[PDB]
Design a protein around this ligand. Structure first.
Ligand SMILES: CCCCCCCCCC(=O)O
Length: 133
């Protein structure tokens, strides 16, 4: 079910990431650096367990989870959230909850590219990743 998402992916397009970060309360200096970073995202599985790494010259993160089972997460911007990841319409949907707030991180494959849509408040960011061999 998750298999075409697996592998190493590199950021190749970003729209409205500053808006998204600002909505989350990320400070201006972090938003500068992040606006010029191109992370590598690595998605792997081992049985029921998925591990999602995000690597860059600025922030690195790693999470492991089972689909459909809540997990604790500390995000790149230091939010402590309650998370769940699930497949919905063939999209990998990651929902984070904290302080009564929510944000969604939705991944879908379109023409072989991985499109990540980030929504918080009214801000909608679209980031495109392409697969590394
Ligand atoms: C430093 C800002 C962090 C915002 C939350 C994480 C954004 C992930 C973006 C991505 O994986 O392409």
């Amino acid at each position: 079910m998750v298999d075409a998402f697996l592998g190493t992916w590199k950021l190749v397009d970003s729209k409205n990431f500053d808006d998204y970060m600002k909505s989350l309360g990320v400070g201006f200096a972090t938003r500068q650096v992040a606006s010029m970073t191109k992370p590598t995202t690595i998605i792997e599985k081992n049985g029921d367990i998925l591990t999602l790494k995000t690597h860059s010259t600025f922030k690195n993160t790693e999470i492991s989870f089972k689909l459909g089972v809540e997990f604790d997460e500390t995000t790149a911007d230091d939010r402590k959230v309650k998370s769940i990841v699930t497949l919905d319409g063939g999209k990998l949907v990651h929902l984070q909850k904290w302080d009564g707030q929510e944000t969604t991180l939705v991944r879908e494959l379109i023409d072989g590219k991985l499109i990540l849509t980030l929504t918080h408040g009214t801000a909608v960011c679209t980031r495109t990743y392409e697969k590394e061999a």
